[PDB]
Amino acid sequence: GGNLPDVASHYPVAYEQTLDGTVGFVIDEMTPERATASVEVTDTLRERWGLVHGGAYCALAAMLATEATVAVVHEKGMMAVGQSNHTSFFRPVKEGHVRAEAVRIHAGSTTWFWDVSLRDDAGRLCAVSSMSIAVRPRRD
Amino acid sequence: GGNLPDVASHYPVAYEQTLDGTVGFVIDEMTPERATASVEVTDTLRERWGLVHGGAYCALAAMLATEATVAVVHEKGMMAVGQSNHTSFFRPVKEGHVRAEAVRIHAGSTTWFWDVSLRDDAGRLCAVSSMSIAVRPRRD
């Protein structure tokens, strides 16, 4: 459903049932250095005051940054998982879409780093979220 | 509902339709200095690898921190919204619950700061999330 990178033959939880499937995250482009995704704003994305939830921008950043790393390292026997996230909220989003662009800024052996920009339909930069992703040898 | 602070006669989005109500966040205690909330793990809270989504710890921290601020400042004519968030992920959660405790560490005239601990059912510290909350005069 969401176009997450297909790196495994099966997954513990299907897209539609995940947080990401529930709120409607969809990945558009995906390369080792850059990934983009979007989501249509609906109440399920908002908090009680009618604005997109701060948690939604973080979740979209965490998924996109982590999965962009997974797309490269999994076939090398590595697992990749977000280790830290820092989000700044510059302006709220009331409706329309949120579009995320993840740009790889450092790729170390144990940690990758991505800057994610989150824009509204007018192209205004509404939030930024940077992700540090830990890369470790798969256990299983 | 989620027991969010009842400060206004009408809210733009009903609890059950918000992201918060969708994933099942509920506030337990709330005072000016400290607040606690919890959620049952379901697939809606998970990513496709079967663990609680990074976004979920951040979303919980953000609502809890911001709303504990609203609880104080709203009746004073002020609006409060998360301005930034920094989250670090120490151990995953596969199932059970996530419990948040938010401790106010600074209450400035324009900015309030909260540290939020996220623990599993064994009590282990799985993530921490710092929230900075902007406090501004309410627009009419």
Added chain:
Amino acid sequence: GGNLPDVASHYPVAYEQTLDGTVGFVIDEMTPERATASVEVTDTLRERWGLVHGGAYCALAAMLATEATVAVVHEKGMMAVGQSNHTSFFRPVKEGHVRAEAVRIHAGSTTWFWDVSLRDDAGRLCAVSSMSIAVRPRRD
């Protein structure tokens, strides 16, 4: 001096006595959207392991970001001060120089945000540092 923006007739501390002058920070370019600064590595910039001190990347980012804000807002009756900083360390620097480039990404009425890149003499990205800058009316 360090070529900091000349916005006032008197400053409480002379360049050469500040932390900035002590370690040798110097601003090269400064515009409303972008500013650059550099420092020669000396032992004064190092920790006891012989590498550039973590604090030094943060100090450089903080002065550069805040002062690029002062450069705009001071003549408008506003004071600007760093409010938060997030720094990630990708590679150490043993010797040579550290070059900073600060790019303004949001300019709000109360908060400005800058991303600062810190590079070695080979051009490699050694650290990044995000600064949030508070902008408030100047106290008389």
Added chain:
Amino acid sequence: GGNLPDVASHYPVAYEQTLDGTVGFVIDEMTPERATASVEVTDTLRERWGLVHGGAYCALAAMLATEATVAVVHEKGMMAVGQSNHTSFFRPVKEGHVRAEAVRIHAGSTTWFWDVSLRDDAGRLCAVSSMSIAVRPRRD
């Protein structure tokens, strides 16, 4: 001079010559779970506006958190180095001292995490700085 943990027979740079020796950082208590340090404010610690430099609070946090980790892991064949820092500035310090308390919150196999509180002489919490420290096998 600064009471840094004595874990090696020699060091690349002597205390007095380091950033830390220059500005005057001194460690008081040091255990695996908690460390404290202070520094006397003098112009060398301040920026041109007469307030303690934002970089000074970060440097004191980075040193104290990293060195508290070094104190445990070095004798186990590990190196420890700060990997990220996030600092919030709640109130400025004009003079007197800055006192730092570092509290260990997580100790993983590859990353430790410390929260550092930075107080003035009245005991007010002026800044907080959290440090993530990478722990890796020594190379040499």
